[PDB]
Design a protein around this ligand. Structure first.
Ligand SMILES: [N-]=[N+]=N[C@@H]1[C@H](O)[C@@H](CO)O[C@H]1n1ccc(N)nc1=O
Lengths: 212, 213, 213, 213
C-alpha cells in the first residue's frame, strides 16, 4: 500500500507538462488535502545559486538544463519518503533571488504521484523509485519550433539569444544527459499532448489503480 | 463494435511475443475457442498467392517477402472491415513452400478485442485507419538482428552466411523503406517487446476494462 | 571530361556556403569570369514551369516547393549529361517569389570541375550516376532550422509564425521522405557545413589536383 | 617538419582497420622497409591497460568491459603519440594478453601517422593531437553481421556468446562512448573499405603532404 510513482521524461517542449496536466484534468483531480493524484516538477528542485552562479545567470551563461543545476540529493530524499508514505515539503524556488523561499508547499501521500522532468531518469537511484517510466518523444526540430514560439509569445525573449542558448546549453544537455535515458522508459508516448489515445490509456490505468 | 489494435515493428522486435503474452495474461488460453474475447491475427497469414512469374523469382531467391507487394492488402482490408461489422470471417492458411493458400481455412468468431500484428500493419492508410489503437515495438536494429540469427538456426536449418546475406540484402532495406516510415502513425511505442512487462500489463489492464465495460 | 561533383544536404545545412567557399579558396572569384575552371550550378535554378493551377495552390502558401515533382528532372538530366559531353549549356534564371522562368538564360561555358548543389541532387537515379563524387552535408535537424529561421527573418523580411509553419508543414516532411534517404548514396559526408575547414580544404585541394593534371 | 596525425574512429567492424590498410597499400607503403616507412598505422588495441588485481578479478570472471575507456592506457597513448610529433623513434606494446605484453615494436618517425580505435576521439587531449579526424560510420546491424562473422572465423567461439557479449558490452559502450564522439569528426566515411571514392580521396591527400603542398 504505497504511492504509485510514475516518472515522466522527454526533451524540452516535447509536451511533458501538458501530458501530465491533461491527465489530472481528465481524472478531475484539480482538494489538496485529499487529492489522490499529484504532480511533482523537477523544476521545483533547483539548487541555490552562489553569487558567482547568480551573476552568470544574468549574463545568460548559466546552464539550467545541466544535472548540476538540480538538487539530486533533495529529489531522492523527497521521492523516497513519498514511496514510504510520508508527507513531504516541496520547495518553492524564487528565481529572482535564485534561492528557496522559506514558505514551502505541502503534499500528502497520494495514491499515484507523477514526477516530470527532463533529467528524471538520469540518476539511477531516482530511476529505480519509479514503478512506471514514460518518455514523451517528439522530433528535435519539432520541439525547437515549439520552444521558440513559447519563449517569444509567452516569455518575450530575444530570438537570437533563444537560439544561441539552445545551441550552447539546451541541445547538448539533452543529447548528453536526457536522450541517453530514453532506453530506460517502459512506454514511449510520441507527439506529446495531442496523442489522446496514449493519454486515455494512461488515464484509465490510474483510475484502475484508484479503483483497486 | 470490436476493439481493433494494430501491432507493428521490425522483425524480431517482439510483436508476436508481445501479443502472445498479452492474451496469455488475460486468461484467454483457458477461455474456450468459440468464446475467446481476445484473438490474434497475423499479417503473415495474408501473404498473396504468388504468380508463376513471382514464384520463379522466389525459388531463385530474388523475391522480397518483406515488401508491401507480397501481401494481400485487399483481403486484409475486406477481412478486417468485415470483422468490425461483427461478421464471422474465415482466415486463409498459407503454404510457404508452395506460395499458395491451402484448401483449409480458419474460422474466427467475433471477439471483443482483436490484435492484428505485422511488419506492414500501418503501411496502407485504409487498413491503418481501422485500428482504434496502434502499437509499435521499437527494438534496436542490431538487437533485433541478434535475435533473428539465433531464431533462424533453431527454427530452421540454414547457414550463418545465408541468414546475414539475406538480412542485409532483403530484410534491412524493406524495414527502412517501408516499416520504419510508419512508426510516425503509432499511438504508443513499446520499447523492447515481451521483455517489457510494465508495457504489457498496461495494455493487458486496458483490454480488461474494455472486456469488463 | 568535366569532373562533376554533386553536393546534397538538408536546407540550411551549408551546401551553397561550402560550394561558394570551395571556389573562393581556389581563385575563381579573381579570374576571367567567362569559362572558369570550376562552376557552381544550383538546383534551385531548375524549377518546373507549371504555374496556373499550381499558382492557384502556390500563391497563398499552399504549395510544396521542396517536393521532387517541382523540379525539372528531365532538364537536370539534359543539362548535366550534356555538360559531361563537353557541350555548352544555357541555364534558366528564376525569381524565387514569383515562380518566374525568365526569358533570359545564363550561358555556362564548359568547365573542368562542376559543382551541383541541391536538396534532392541524389534523388533521381539517372542524374545521380552522372556525379563522379557525391558529397552530403550532415547538419543536425534543429541546428539547420535555427540557421534557416535566422536567414529568412533577416534576409527575406519574413516573420516567425509563417516561417515555422512553412518549415513544419512542408520543409520538414520532404527532407525526411526524399532528401534524408539519399544520404545512402554519398561517398563523403561533411559534418557541420561551411565552418568545417578541414573537410573544405581536403576537397579544395583535391580539385586543385584535378585542375593541375 | 612535424608528422601529420590522422585520427580514425568508428564502431567495431565499421571498416577502420581496412580503410587504414587499404590506404597504405595504395601508397605502396608496406612495400618499403620497416625502417623507412612514410605513413604508419597505430591501433588503439595495442595500448590496452595493464590493469589492477581488482580489475584482474572482474576480468577473470568474464564480466569485464574491454570496450570501456578505462581498459586503455590513456596515458601511454597520449605520451607515445606526443613523442611521435617530436620526431622520436617510439615503442608500442603488443596485444592485450588473454593483462600484459612482453616484447615491443619499433616505430621510426614517419611523415604521416594513422591512429585507429573505437575511442580515438574520446579523450580531449589525444583528440586535439589530430590535424585531421575521420569517422567511419557504418550501420549498427551491418557492423554486427561483419563482426559476428569475423568473431566466428578468426576466433572460433560459439555463437551464443559472441552475440551475448556484443549486446552486453560492445553495444552499450559504442552508444555511450563511441557514438557521442562522432560530432568531433572532420570527415565521415560512410561504408568503410568498399568506399573507394572516399579512400582514394584520402590516399591522394597523403600523397600531397608527402611531397610538396
Ligand atoms: N519558470 N521557469 N522556467 C524555466 C525553465 O522551465 C527551466 C528550464 O528547465 O528553468 C527556468 N529558466 C528560467 C530563466 C532562464 N533564462 N532559463 C531557464 O531555463
Amino acid at each position: 500500500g504505497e504511492p504509485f510513482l510514475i516518472g515522466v521524461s522527454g526533451g524540452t517542449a516535447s509536451g511533458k507538462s501538458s501530458v501530465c496536466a491533461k491527465i489530472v484534468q481528465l481524472l478531475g483531480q484539480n482538494d489538496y488535502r485529499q487529492k489522490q493524484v499529484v504532480i511533482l516538477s523537477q523544476d521545483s528542485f533547483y539548487r541555490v545559486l552562489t553569487s558567482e552562479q547568480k551573476a552568470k545567470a544574468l549574463k545568460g551563461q548559466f546552464n539550467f538544463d545541466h544535472p548540476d543545476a538540480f538538487d539530486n540529493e533533495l529529489i531522492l530524499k523527497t521521492l523516497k519518503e513519498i514511496t514510504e508514505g510520508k508527507t513531504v515539503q516541496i520547495p518553492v524556488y524564487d528565481f529572482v533571488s535564485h534561492s528557496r523561499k522559506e514558505e514551502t508547499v505541502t503534499v500528502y501521500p497520494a495514491d499515484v504521484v507523477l514526477f516530470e522532468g527532463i533529467l528524471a531518469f538520469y540518476s539511477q537511484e531516482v530511476r529505480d523509485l519509479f514503478q512506471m517510466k514514460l518518455f514523451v518523444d517528439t522530433d528535435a526540430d519539432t520541439r525547437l519550433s515549439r520552444r521558440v514560439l513559447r519563449d517569444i509569445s509567452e516569455r518575450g525573449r530575444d530570438l537570437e539569444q533563444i537560439l544561441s542558448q539552445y545551441i550552447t546549453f539546451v541541445k547538448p544537455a539533452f543529447e548528453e544527459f536526457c536522450l541517453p535515458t530514453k532506453k530506460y522508459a517502459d512506454v514511449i508516448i510520441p507527439r506529446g499532448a495531442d496523442n489522446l489515445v496514449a493519454i486515455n490509456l494512461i488515464v484509465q490505468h490510474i483510475q484502475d489503480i484508484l479503483n483497486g
